[PDB]
Design a protein around this ligand. Sequence first.
Ligand SMILES: CC(C)(O/N=C/c1ccc(C(=N)N)cc1)C(=O)O
Ligand SMILES: [Ca+2]
Length: 223
Amino acid sequence: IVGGYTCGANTVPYQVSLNSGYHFCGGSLINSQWVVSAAHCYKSGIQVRLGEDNINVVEGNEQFISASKSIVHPSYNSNTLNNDIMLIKLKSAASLNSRVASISLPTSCASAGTQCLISGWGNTKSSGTSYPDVLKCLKAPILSDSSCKSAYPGQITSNMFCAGYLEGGKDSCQGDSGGPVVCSGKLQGIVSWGSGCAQKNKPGVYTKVCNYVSWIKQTIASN
Ligand SMILES: CC(C)(O/N=C/c1ccc(C(=N)N)cc1)C(=O)O
Ligand SMILES: [Ca+2]
């Protein structure tokens, strides 16, 4: 997260870290057994880490649970990043409490102009590299579809939305991939892509979760 703020320990209790010997992506806990992340975050041997603030220090509130299965969206296209969403099933149910909590799936799509909370342990620099220990947060508005399409001509599908600041300086980044974009207390987006980070006229592009609720519900009802 570039140009954001320190969230505060466990103030984003649905935030997960995906670990494969090291943090490599974020995710969102949607119930005691399931995490939503980006399909581009797929790999084998994922351990889900819940209740994290400092990802490099065991602080006492964590739950580390291995993934038992990963389900990439059936229409995910890794070239265009259309349908950039994946479900991850935990080997055992998370114990839900104040520091580890699920986030609601939306019943309707969020509106342009709506403020959302984006979070992660990704790069905090728009140029160069610096990775934080503690969870970072960013408040950012959903952009109009026309401004989103104008920023990325020929690349924005109906399964994507833009959020952030056209002036640059504030954005998600590499390492935040798969993490939550929460608007009005519902999981509305997943950190997906963008040209660099916090670049002028290049806002963040996010997987449009409201399009996937039916697939999510059906998949979790059968796996
Ligand atoms: C695989 C892929 C496309 O992952 N992309 C991550 C990403 C996340 C957020 C942003 C952003 N909001 N500017 C930009 C890029 C990559 O590393 O090239
Ligand atoms: Ca920790």
